Symmetry: D2
Subunit: 385 residues, 4 copies
Amino acid sequence: MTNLGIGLIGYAFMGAAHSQAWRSAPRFFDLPLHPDLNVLCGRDAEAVRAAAGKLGWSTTETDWRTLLERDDVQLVDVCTPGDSHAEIAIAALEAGKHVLCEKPLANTVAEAEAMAAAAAKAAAGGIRSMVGFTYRRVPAIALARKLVADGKIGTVRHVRAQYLQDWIADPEAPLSWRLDKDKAGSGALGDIGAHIVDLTQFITGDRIAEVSGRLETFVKERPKPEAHSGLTASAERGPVTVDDAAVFLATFRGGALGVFEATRFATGRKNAIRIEINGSKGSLAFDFEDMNLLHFYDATEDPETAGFRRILATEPVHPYVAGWWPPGHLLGYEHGFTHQVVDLVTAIAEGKDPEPSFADGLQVQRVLAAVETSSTSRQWQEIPE
Amino acid sequence: MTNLGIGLIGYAFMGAAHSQAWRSAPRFFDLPLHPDLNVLCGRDAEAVRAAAGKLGWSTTETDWRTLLERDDVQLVDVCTPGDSHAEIAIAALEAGKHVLCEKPLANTVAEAEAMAAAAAKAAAGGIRSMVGFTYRRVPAIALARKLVADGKIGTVRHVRAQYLQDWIADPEAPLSWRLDKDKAGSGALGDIGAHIVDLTQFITGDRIAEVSGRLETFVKERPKPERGPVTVDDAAVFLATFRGGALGVFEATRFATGRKNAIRIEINGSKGSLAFDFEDMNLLHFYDATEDPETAGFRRILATEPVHPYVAGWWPPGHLLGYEHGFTHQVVDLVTAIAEGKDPEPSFADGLQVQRVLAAVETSSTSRQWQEIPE
Amino acid sequence: MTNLGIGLIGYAFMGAAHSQAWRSAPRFFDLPLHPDLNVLCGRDAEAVRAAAGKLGWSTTETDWRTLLERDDVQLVDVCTPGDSHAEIAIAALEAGKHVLCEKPLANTVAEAEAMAAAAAKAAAGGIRSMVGFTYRRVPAIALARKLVADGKIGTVRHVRAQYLQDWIADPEAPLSWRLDKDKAGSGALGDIGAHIVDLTQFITGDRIAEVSGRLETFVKERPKPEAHSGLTASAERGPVTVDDAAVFLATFRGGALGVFEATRFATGRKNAIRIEINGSKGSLAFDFEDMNLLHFYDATEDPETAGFRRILATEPVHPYVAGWWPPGHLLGYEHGFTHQVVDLVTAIAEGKDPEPSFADGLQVQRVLAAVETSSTSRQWQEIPE
Amino acid sequence: MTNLGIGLIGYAFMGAAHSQAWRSAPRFFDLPLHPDLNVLCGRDAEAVRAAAGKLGWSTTETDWRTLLERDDVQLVDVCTPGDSHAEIAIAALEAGKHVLCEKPLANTVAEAEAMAAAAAKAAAGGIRSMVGFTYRRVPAIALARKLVADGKIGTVRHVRAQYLQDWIADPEAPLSWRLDKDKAGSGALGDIGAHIVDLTQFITGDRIAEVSGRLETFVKERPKPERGPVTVDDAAVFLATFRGGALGVFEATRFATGRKNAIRIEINGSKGSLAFDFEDMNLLHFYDATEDPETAGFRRILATEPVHPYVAGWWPPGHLLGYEHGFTHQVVDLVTAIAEGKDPEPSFADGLQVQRVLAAVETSSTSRQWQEIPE
């Protein structure tokens, strides 16, 4: 085997971001297998043909189940909303196909448990799976993980993380699927809270032990998708059934305090994923709106010169950067997807289980469920270890 | 009446920062009364005499109660730890002396209630009082309040605030009174949590309704200045909802390695947002959500224009101010309130409401339950 | 015609950056013609075949002249060093091929004049040409141009620009082609000075009228490419024949003062292209290491709230951004190349002359020549209007 | 000897900023001599008496020459425009008075030469003098000098400096003495160009060798405080080489719309780089080029540690300082130099070398020729 046949399900949701990664990866990195964009799945035959020509896929299929039967599909990339992840990923693994699944892993803990079980059985048969928490593959974030691994942070006292967006801060913005509890599973919590739960656990190497949470919906009714705005009446609106924001306190198993905030109503903030970790030997700070920077404070340095150093994460020694451009020639949102592909293809070729695993996705799911339950119950909730 | 005699108690705690304000205020601002630095109080006779020479005070007294009798003390500035705030401030008010008292107002809600009760009765008799939440008088913070008052923020959805310091992040840093519950009341919570509770409430003009909190002590014993116990929190974190509906997220800690006095506030509303960091004290960032998306963004307002609060007393644009200036501004406002027959803000009633927030956070931590704040 | 056949010369220099643009442009933008990556040119047949498979080109040719004969080449992309631009671009235009040429336009004013003449004759016959000053197509930069065009800056008093890099700040870094006067034409001046001359003229819409300049070489000898470092002797080094840094004062035709600095010895600065323009109605500030931001001060705003606003250049109303990702989902160095392609393909389809033209490239060349002459002569030099 | 009597000339120009320094220095620093604010000079009797009350001066004099006779004036602080610096400072030195003189040292090189000559002779007789380039005493700038002295920057390749202000960017802003060549000597060049010339030379420890300059006046006539001519430059830009080989690029202007007091300096060397902006005064950024590329970068040093220059006199970490503090630091250093029998820096000789740089830039502009600076 020199090539790895790819089939993608969910082009309407993440097709552009995922497809560019499959196209670019072997051009910028020397991969042990060449990914072939073989099959794009979609029920609307004319729309999926159009998408296939735009995105670079050779054939299309109406029925996702067909991808699991085709010898030219070795790996299924599942990009749909959480409500369909368990059905599709479990089937794919049982059909002997490697799987890349978007986050969050599922819509319920029960689903995620079933996925983790299937992933374990599959791994025993050489069939690999990964949950695509893309921001782990931002070079600055991978660098932060390395600095912790190298011991430069020491005993972690504090984790603080915010994921601040504003894309529905306007109450007149209409209803859609990310606002429908049934497809999306949750709102801010599941969509963007998941990212920061996973990023903080990834960087520290520690896990959240207990949480105290509050979910809020600021705008509970919104114009229906084709409401009439005349010279919008009350009868033209429908209910919002997910959270607009989720906030929570945490303790980590190692003892650190954590403070988390994810919202779609942070007016002026667009994709501001903010993380700061404070430990006995140093601290790290990151903001995705400055994605190419990692700030690092060394607490062992002479107080005369100690301070957060601005590390421009564009050196060839930084994770992934060697595949791209010279120092100061910035990367962006899309590169992390390519880096995922590089790491997934490489794991498959080397017979290794990719990270984050479905088991890792399940633990994240358990944190999300605990925050939600904590909000409704008004009680702290422990996370199964 | 042209002069206002001042007596100060607690020089060893805040003596330098308060004295520079009393000295500077009439030189930089045209005040309706001239503050006279008349009496410095301290029980160590040699130490208080030295401090009086250094700090600009004309006479000294061993017994704080003597300030209550002296005709040349019109106003008592109380800078001791919270354990002594109630006894001193209430006596002073009852003796017909105006009072400035440091934060937090007291060590317990019951003490704060007695203080606010005395202040209310005293104010009806023309005797003024103020609690010194100094960061209100940072020009950028006063400007933030003004932008809210002008309607530029709209319906507030989020309040986030952090007060990040690292001064005891070293486990071998020694005990002091700030680590002693019997002196300070609490640790991070009362010392720096109080500041951000008050700052967010002041800027928004709204009040916290309920909280969920957790206090933590990372280092439980330290060297004496032999070793002893740390009996307060090193950090306090809490969720909040505000009466107007906003979600709040608060974090105050002495263990944020690399952060020195980072008071960070962001407020997000339907019409705009504000952001501030004290380590960039001279800046306020303001995003106008009603602006064309082509150019909408947080604008960096350098708070050094003569139209900005207090700045006209000082230096030209870009000629930065710092930590000490807010104390002078406190003095300007307090002296002017007294002269004009007005009650200064924050009032002891305001101080009491903050105390109730602090008590709720602490009680939430131990009980593991959400706690409502009385109105 | 629905397709536009591309041939690229100079893959070893800019092949990755240019090829990704030709591949991505029709996938992210709805182009009036589809660019086909038909021919990659290179004299080393085995190396160019390898490059063609990596970069996405269908065939290769040994002799660049062959591209000018092929009916499947409509447009020649010239990526080589300045020393070959005039020979290749003039020939291409005379063969009826559209041309994209890298900056600077040439190595001498005489060459650039010959290129501008050929471009004029070609344009009369419907054959288009552009000089690829890529940073004009950074969305923040295009936005800055729009704000000026909209009148928001007013009378310009000051232009300040720096291009700060450090890639040869180490004296032991060895000799190469960008250090050889004969291929490169100059060092910092021609390489990175050209970028800031053009960016400031583009944004303001004004031209430099006179300059006072100084060129410097800090490290005049460097280890030869295969020098022996034993237990590096003096005999193992060779001379550096270009400038390491170029600084100059300018006045603009409208009256503004300009202050320019380009260097390869700004230790710690990687690709920091810094521009600030101050005018009667407002000011603009930009730093490529924060490429996704434009800072804009409105001088007509109430002093109570006037200040530089941080514009995150990721709204769909900002130039080019609609083709990419949602707000806060950052772009990077590579996107400007794609935007060049979009604008070039669109100009060709619409029968318009692309900007910057070869004539615009010539005027830049005249500024560069004046700075160099000013340095040697120790006298101010006027730029032909 | 325990006290040092001060007399100040030029209150209407720098009276507030200099007086706060003389008042504050002994309260925050343990000084070997106590400065006594004894005499304020001014020809308008009522105005100078009011200012003396405001600013803390015990007596007043109409004639500046009277300060030269009075035994309670040991040190003359000269704050007038440059047109009067030479006459006053030389007379004071000759009368056996120590001198602090504002920048630039004078209006002409010839005047600066006479001042430096008098200062040299006076210093041999124990009479000290200093030119007040105040920004040297910003803690972050003093730290920058220390990092250079420690060898952390190595061989300097680049110096870039800007002093960006906008206070007369409005064409209708009125004339003042700062726009009058006969009072100020020059405009942006002498007022703010001088600061960045001295700052870069001080930090690097090197001197400018040659310059190519251009001065521009954007608004040539303005309203009086009827209209009159602006007889100075609004902006001064110049290239430089330093004696050690570095290239320098300098820009000073009053027309940088949106910039208020943005003094920006960056120094790039073989072993590291430094960057500073006064609008972020409490920060110094330091890049160590000898660091592993995995983590190399400019570190943000908050200049509020007790090991940083002067900071031990003030407030805890993160408790920011501002513009006024450098004046106090000047006083600390000047009083201590006098007490210890040392010559303070910058000296009048240092002031003269800066004057020669300014003269060269101006002469370069008019002649359109590069100009060398004498050593």
